[model samples]
Target chain A: AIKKAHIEKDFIAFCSSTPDNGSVFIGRLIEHMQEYACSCDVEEIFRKVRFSFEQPDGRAQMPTTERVTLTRCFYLFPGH
Target chain B: NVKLCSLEEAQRIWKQKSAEIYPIMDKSSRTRLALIICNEEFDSIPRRTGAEVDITGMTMLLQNLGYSVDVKKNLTASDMTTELEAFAHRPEHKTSDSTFLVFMSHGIREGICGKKHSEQVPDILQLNAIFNMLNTKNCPSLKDKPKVIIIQAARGDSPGVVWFKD
Candidate 1:
């Protein structure tokens, strides 16, 4: 099925859960990313495909999801 | 003369540009909301340490954006499903401009592994199910609104984990 962001299951890390030193560290990113999502337009965020991130075990993996979902998020159009 | 602008200049630029960014939901009377279900130490699976860090950061960030946080900790797959269903149908959503659903736990290829997750009796909340639940057909109130889903867990047998943040 076509999805907005589809990362393969194999490349994703099982992740690190050390209580203090985990590797699936989205926490370090949430503040800024969410801020952007909340305040700014998101078509730019969801548009354009392909990005890379390091697996928990230290391997570079590229998520290859197509932005085919026509139903993009955000309500902004051109003017209020 | 300067190619780069300072923070104040950038903010001013956005203010002028944002006027053209149409349909920016009337967030002045914000009804934004967030639901976070973080499962750390499962009953059988290994403990998912350091998850509390995510929980804290996510909670504060959502709050700062004027969303009420519904944070649940250490839930099984069943619990996750129930909570998700409830959140989807909540009255609060009728007026909400957007919502965030965050699930962090030990997981398998099928989906988020609950507390009792094991090789034999795998208890998982299928990842696909979330899409169906919050889709236009099921959740009409949230239609045309942003429903961000963030899943952080393992989707494999070994190696490590991945994150799905939309």
Candidate 2:
């Protein structure tokens, strides 16, 4: 996901937490979204991708089959 | 042409230009703060790791934050205690109402190092129960005023001391 800052280059966030999601999951998500458009480190790209199954609304019907759940913390750091 | 500046002007210019600065004791304010900075000791003793560095950083930080700092290096245990007592009893030294005593030296668990004869004394004598000594019931000058003692030295050893993880 892309986020712009007032003083520095736009920040990019790639969050992978819980839900059996791994680095491969992150790469696959990025690849799938490339069909709509693709850009990296570009300001004004206005991109944000959520690979989360968090039912914040608690109303949308989601897939449920194999029993697997995970709890994790997000890591945020300043990029060079 | 010959020119001579006043004492204040000379001092001001010297302070501005000098790479290193020493504190000048002034008796105007009632609170007096003294800092004791020491590192190397004679006869070669292996100082605990990060001991001296902590002192240097703390002393500089305190001074930069505006404190009347006085530093003495390589002092005996008796000397340290004597200095603390004198600072607390401002009238004895003609100092001020409140005093700050900072001890930076190679220290063992209960006490610090003394120069000759290698004296060992309780750390409290360094402050000598000054808080209770100057309690409102006793020493009137110190009564009702905030008495604080900050001990930064490590008291004990435990596991997991180093961690600079990613």
Backbone clash total for model 2 is 1
lDDT of 1 by residue, A1-80 (tens): 85453321101111222222233346434533453443344444332111214333454333222212324334222112
Q: Summarize candidate 2's per-residue lDDT along B1-166 as a digit string, tens digits.
A: 0122345544554555453322233434434454553434634444434445545554553343234566666655556656555555555223332333444344444444444323342322332333333333333444322232332222222111233558
Q: Pick the candidate with the highest lDDT.
A: 1
Fnat across every predicted model, in order = 0.10, 0.00
Q: Which residue pairs overlap in candidate 2's backbone?
A: B124-B128
Superposition-based RMSD of candidate 2 using all C-alpha atoms, in angstroms: 24.6
For each candidate, give its TM-score against the true structure: 0.67, 0.37
What is candidate 1's CAPRI-style docking category based on DockQ?
Answer: incorrect
- The CA lDDT of each predicted structure is 0.57, 0.34
lDDT of 1 at A74: 44
Per-residue error for B162 in candidate 1, Å, reads: 17
Q: Could you say which candidate leads in DockQ?
A: 1
